[PDB]
């Protein structure tokens, strides 16, 4: 399973009476779905990219100065015209030096002087911004069932089907081998906010750098560097990298501000990275809402039997997942294939099996089977696999795991979670009331401030909270109550 290759793993159970479930497929999580009477599925978003989209303003971080000429004149001898002023990608600045007779004048005073350069750029020193067109954007969702085989990260899984979701193809069916079909409907428009996202790009051929980044729109449109387009020859505002010193009556010296790469890299603290696999410009973080239909699925191994009790041996040690499940792998060298007798009693009653399974109906195939995963209540637990058993203590608490689900219910509610309340499925007065409370909330609160940052958020929140104490009208003292929201909410 791919969900056992990473940290962020969120279980979403499937009740009987509700078989079409809406998810949120973030990028960097893996949602395991366990439907009763249906094969449990692992669903995750794989990649978000676009095959060579449009690009915006580029920025040159290292100005290539060339053809540096200075015109100077005696104070009343005609402020000198220069032909170099009238091309683009040229920077000029008028100034009043003090001509002497050390440079062969007739009078003294404010000698007029002007210098000019041709502000070119250095090779592969462009800060290329990109934008998204949803015509070529692809959301890739790979789904892997629990076939009983475990597959590594460097390996590939044979039954791992892959669904691409453009905005044009928003309804996709995937035959999951013998398990059946899964119906997937992902709305690309109701996902990553593509409008306020700039993909920045430096030299991708430099080895030890992130290839692309994922920065803000109005942040990017107000940088203070030289800026050209795709295929532009002239520059605009190139006097930002070019700073003129004070002259000494003949040569006003011109100074480059060198490379500004690390300057920009200090401005990317808290950015999500973005991979570039040549053509594609991948994102590494995002979100989308999909719908998972499991009515066209069914189990595998219902016309088989329960296995032997004896021929199970531990290939693999039952250990905790870090997400309160116990994984294993058996070596069954007998009557294949068959339903593995997986059962796990508790402490206090050895009668009742309490093995909340994650791989339902495990079968040791003629070339497959073995991987079993189960969730258990706290306490001592004897996980039987036939005659073969295993002493286990579930280390999580009873209220601790429910509180862990609340912890996920807190830390999921960052800016990803501001759009994402589809962790449930058609709640009516539960889910849609969450949208009713939070869509206007996050919709207005991100609109205000323009995005301002943790320091000014935890400054201005405390500022308005201090202004709450100095309040004229107690009926209008709910501005303090507004200020209280402006401290605690935006600390994620």
């Amino acid at each position: 399973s791919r969900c056992t290759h990473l940290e962020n793993r969120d279980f979403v159970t499937g009740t009987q009476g509700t078989t079409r479930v809406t998810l949120v497929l973030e990028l960097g999580g893996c949602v395991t779905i366990t439907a009763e009477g249906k094969p449990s599925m692992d669903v995750w978003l794989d990649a978000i990219y676009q095959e060579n989209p449009a690009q915006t303003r580029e920025y040159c971080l290292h100005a290539k100065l060339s053809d540096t000429k200075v015109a100077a004149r005696c104070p009343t001898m005609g402020p000198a015209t220069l032909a170099e002023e009238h091309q683009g990608g040229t920077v000029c600045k008028r100034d009043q030096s003090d001509r002497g007779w050390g440079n062969h004048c007739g009078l003294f005073g404010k000698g007029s002087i002007v210098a000019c350069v041709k502000a070119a750029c250095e090779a592969k020193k462009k800060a290329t911004g990109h934008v998204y067109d949803a015509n070529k954007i692809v959301y890739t969702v790979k789904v892997e069932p629990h076939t009983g085989d475990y597959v590594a990260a460097n390996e590939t899984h044979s039954g791992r089907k892959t669904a691409s979701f453009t905005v044009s193809s928003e309804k996709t069916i995937l035959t999951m081998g013998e398990y059946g079909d899964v119906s997937l409907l992902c709305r690309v428009a109701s996902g990553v906010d593509l409008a306020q996202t700039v993909i920045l790009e430096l030299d991708k051929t430099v080895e030890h750098l992130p290839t692309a980044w994922q920065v803000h729109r109005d942040w990017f449109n107000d940088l203070a560097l030289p800026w050209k387009h795709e295929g532009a020859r002239n520059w605009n505002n190139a006097e930002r990298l070019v700073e003129f010193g004070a002259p000494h009556a003949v040569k006003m010296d011109v100074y480059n501000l060198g490379d500004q790469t690390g300057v920009l890299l200090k401005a990317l603290a808290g950015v999500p990275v973005a991979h570039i696999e040549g053509t594609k410009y991948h994102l590494k973080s995002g979100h989308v809402t999909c719908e998972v239909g499991l009515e066209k699925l069914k189990m595998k191994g219902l016309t088989y039997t329960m296995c032997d009790k004896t021929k199970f041996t531990w290939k693999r040690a039952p250990t905790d997942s870090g997400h309160d499940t116990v994984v294993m792998e058996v070596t069954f060298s007998g009557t294949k294939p068959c339903r593995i007798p997986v059962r796990a009693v508790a402490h206090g009653s050895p009668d009742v099996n309490v093995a909340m399974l994650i791989t339902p109906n495990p079968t040791i195939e003629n070339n497959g089977g073995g991987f079993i995963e189960m969730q258990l209540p706290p306490g001592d637990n004897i996980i039987y696999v036939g005659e073969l058993s295993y002493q286990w203590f579930q280390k999580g608490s009873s209220i601790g795991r429910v509180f862990q689900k609340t912890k996920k219910g807190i830390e999921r509610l960052t800016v990803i979670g501001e759009h994402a309340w589809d962790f449930g499925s058609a709640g009516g007065f539960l889910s849609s009331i969450g949208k009713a409370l939070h869509t206007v909330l996050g919709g207005a609160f991100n609109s205000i401030f323009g995005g301002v940052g943790f320091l000014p958020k935890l400054l201005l929140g405390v500022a308005l909270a201090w202004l709450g104490l100095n309040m004229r009208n107690p009926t209008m003292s709910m501005s303090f109550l507004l200020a209280g929201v402006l401290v605690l909410a935006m600390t994620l």
């Binding site: 906010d193 990298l241 990317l268 808290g270 973080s285 800016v415 943790f454 104490l469």
Partner: protein
């Protein structure tokens, strides 16, 4: 040349990201740079607490502000 940081956006992130562990702690090293290297002026800040108008709420709202003024 000016660039403000991407502290304004801080848009998403559940994959790989930059130095957010030491992004807010840039300033927490700067202000401690104002403390450990200007110890005389750091002890000059005590002369506002227990000598000037020490109104309870407006002590810290002057102190931490004045310490974080110096870039």
């Amino acid at each position: 040349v000016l660039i403000p940081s991407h502290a304004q956006g801080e848009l998403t992130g559940r994959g790989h990201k930059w130095l957010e562990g030491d992004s807010l702690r840039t300033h927490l090293t700067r202000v401690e740079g104002w403390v450990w290297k200007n110890r005389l002026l750091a002890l000059a800040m005590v002369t506002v607490v227990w000598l000037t108008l020490e109104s309870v709420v407006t002590r810290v709202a002057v102190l931490v502000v004045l310490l974080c003024l110096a870039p």
